[PDB]
A paper describes a structure:
Streptococcus mutans employs a key virulence factor, three glucosyltransferase (GtfBCD) enzymes to establish cariogenic biofilms. While GtfB synthesizes pre-dominantly insoluble glucans, GtfD only produces water-soluble glucans, and GtfC can synthesize both soluble and insoluble glucans. All Gtfs are composed of three functional regions: the N-terminal variable junction region, the C-terminal glucan-binding region, and the highly conserved catalytic region in the middle, which is essential for the glucan synthesis. Previous studies have demonstrated that glucans produced by GtfB and GtfC are essential for the assembly of the S. mutans biofilms, while glucans produced by GtfD serve not only as a primer for GtfB, but also as a source of nutrient for S. mutans and other bacteria.
Seven potent biofilm inhibitors emerged from this study, the lead compound #G43 was further characterized and shown to have anti-biofilm activity through the binding to GtfBC and the inhibition of the activity of GtfBC. Compound #G43 consistently inhibited the activity of both GtfB and GtfC, ImageJ analysis of the intensities suggest 80% inhibition of both enzymes, while compound #G16 had a smaller effect on the activity of GtfB (60% inhibition) and GtfC (70% inhibition). To determine if the inhibition is attributed by the binding of the lead compound to the enzymes, the OctetRed96 system was used to characterize protein-small molecule binding kinetics. The his-tagged catalytic domains of GtfB and GtC were immobilized separately onto an anti-penta-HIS (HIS1K) biosensor which consists of high affinity, high specificity penta-his antibody pre-immobilized on a fiber optic biosensor. This sensor was then exposed to varying concentrations of #G43. Assay data fit to a 1:1 binding model with a fixed maximum response, which produced a KD value of 3.7 µM for GtfB. The KD value for GtfC was more potent at 46.9 nM. As the catalytic domain of GtfB and GtfC shares 96% similarity at amino acid sequence level, the selectivity by the compound is remarkable. Binding studies of this analog against GtfB yielded a KD value of 68 µM, compared to a KD value of 3.7 µM by the active analog. An analog that does not contain this functional group lost the ability to inhibit the activity of Gtfs and in vitro biofilm formation, demonstrating that these effects are directly related and that the inclusion of the primary ortho amide group is crucial to maintaining potent anti-biofilm activity.
Author numbering: 208 to 209, 211 to 1047
Write the structure that this text describes.
Amino acid sequence: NKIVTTRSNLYKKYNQVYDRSAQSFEHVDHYLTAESWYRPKYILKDGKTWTQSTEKDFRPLLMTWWPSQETQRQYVNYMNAQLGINKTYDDTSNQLQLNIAAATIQAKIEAKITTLKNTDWLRQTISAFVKTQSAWNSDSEKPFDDHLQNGAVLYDNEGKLTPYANSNYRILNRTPTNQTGKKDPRYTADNTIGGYEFLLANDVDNSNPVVQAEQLNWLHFLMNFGNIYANDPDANFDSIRVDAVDNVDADLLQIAGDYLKAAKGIHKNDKAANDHLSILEAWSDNDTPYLHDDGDNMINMDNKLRLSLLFSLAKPLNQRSGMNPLITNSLVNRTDDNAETAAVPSYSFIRAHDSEVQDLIRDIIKAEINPNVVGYSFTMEEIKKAFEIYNKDLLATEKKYTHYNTALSYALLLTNKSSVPRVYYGDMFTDDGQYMAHKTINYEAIETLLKARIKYVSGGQAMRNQQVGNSEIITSVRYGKGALKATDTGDRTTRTSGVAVIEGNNPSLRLKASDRVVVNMGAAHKNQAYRPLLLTTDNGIKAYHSDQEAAGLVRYTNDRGELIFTAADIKGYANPQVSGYLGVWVPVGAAADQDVRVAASTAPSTDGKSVHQNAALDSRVMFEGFSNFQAFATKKEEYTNVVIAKNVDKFAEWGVTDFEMAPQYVSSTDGSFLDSVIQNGYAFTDRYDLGISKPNKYGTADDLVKAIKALHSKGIKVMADWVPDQMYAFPEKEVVTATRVDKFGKPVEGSQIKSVLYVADSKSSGKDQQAKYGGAFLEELQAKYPELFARKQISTGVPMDPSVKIKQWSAKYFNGTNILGRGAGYVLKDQATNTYFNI
Ligand SMILES: NC(=O)c1ccccc1NC(=O)c1cc2cc([N+](=O)[O-])ccc2s1
Ligand SMILES: [Ca+2]
């Protein structure tokens, strides 16, 4: 427990600690660290004159004390090299010699403190020395593992030396697959446990009922952000994206779903459901059947269709698969999709802010810049270096790193039945640079598809796979509004709606002279003029924005309703936009204002599901409205949210019904991960700081409020990114009992970190937005919706615990943290007793 200095400093009556007070030491939970400073009784002012300590005369403990005589020697050699004392001390040095060396070092340290009138240089120098000792750096945290940040440490549930960090929970890996602690026997598509607990930074223990209640509190805050912050009911987020589903306790999915039902009534009818359409980012193939059984309170991605698009269209030519998966490899087999309501709702995409963007930057970095890059922990310089290669590759016909056939992918996504398409910002605008400043070469094609989707895309779907010539094509037909089956004759609006997409994925595609591609348009489209919407050209894609813009290319269906194409129409191409073939055709003569979308019904839902993949849901479009690699704004007019408010008419014109905004939390700046480098909003210290204490990357809190209001002014719903997995860069240190683990929480054998003291950054200020809003709504929520707090959650068997409000985050609310490079012995012991110092 408890004086420190004795037979290692021959100055001890002057250098010993001022008093036996805690305020004399820079401690962490009354423990001492290698970097701790303290107030001695006297300071050898200017290295000359012993003076009494001036209450603000703190000095490094390593100036006067050392854990071992080996460490004293290392310190002496290091500080000699730092202070211009050309004299090292070798393995045989005696204690007397080291003490006199340390006294000389102290004298010249105090001389330099007076000379520079600052002690910063000495903070830096002592830190740098400390990081040379294997017990105080990564060497004792090794071996590294496939954790994204090389390793993690799990806080012990019962630590006698740190009882304030104890917990009865920290139940790990309770993914949807593994929510009960055993693999769910219902779901067999993913043989694994369907995720893992430790992803990034400080891992929130979402098995803690108090933390669960605080996650509900935060969810309520986001869904009432307008009301709460700006006292404006038109500035609320309408929906959520559930982040990192496979790395958090799946109880949150019930908590969120219950809330959406209790507070917004999404289970009552489709109008309520589609007004708060919320999504998961859940990567396991079990998560979609799990979510369907849970009640379709949210929708997951169609990962199968995403993979089908990626490998059939986007991959390099020699790595490209056959085309038939595009029809059959997706939640919905689109061979003949004639259902009024699909079995399972989903959203579909080809790229996201992370998926197939930062992966490509990593590919580029590992291939031409830094082959040792760890996960996605890029440096800004690596990113800007990789972006020149990336941007040059985007424009090439032969691409080594970037996607082929973007427009073909979007032609399928934006005409497919039975899924909500999600358009990625970085496929219409550049992934880097200022928001909406520079269009991609595919902007025109994608915009044309969005507007044509509003005007033409409705009805049943038919997909066909035809072997022609040396290769293959696929056709995708939508029959038109009101025609679910090919035999439906339709009315006047059916006649002028529907669409045909013809695609190939092989630039060598050549049809035989005798080859015919017979595309059945449906019984509403006999003897009808059709005109192109999109056509592949030698250099790219020609888009047609009107019936007159295509006057000369009209063709006709026969009396059986079939368009027929020959080698004269279809062949392979190879240009920056197409590797294969794209043709999109629409019927001639749709009124300029034709709109085949349908609004959600208010009729009562009766199947026990909240979200239904019907024509009303199919009429929606999701827009992921940000890029990880957006440039930082240079002026207020370039702020993301300001631009969004100014350009909301464009999103209305594209049919965007759901704007998925970037997470709006003020980013941390530690740079320990991609998110902490480009500051997208996923690395944060304050869950409630939505540009309040300082602008986020996208503007001020007021800019956010105005962007939400502008989006609502067009009937567009807005989605908040709910990120309960982790938090970064806490400002206050804490001492925990910790064990080195893999990303599943399994202890690493032979690690010196095994039920030992470790210094984390895991306490928030207590003076931030969390301190203001934390738990502030739990009384309102329990009053309105008592059944939310009556539910016995699956992973824990007990309800949420709102009896405690989290005003300051602390290690007891976290599973653990990524390894911090502080070592296994950062907390100082008395060498004789082998006991940790506690003041
Ligand atoms: N870094 C993240 O955004 C993240 C977030 C939550 C959970 C895991 C994450 N990791 C991934 O992005 C992965 C993609 C895939 C894709 C598949 N699959 O297609 O089957 C399987 C495993 C992974 S992990
Ligand atoms: Ca986690």
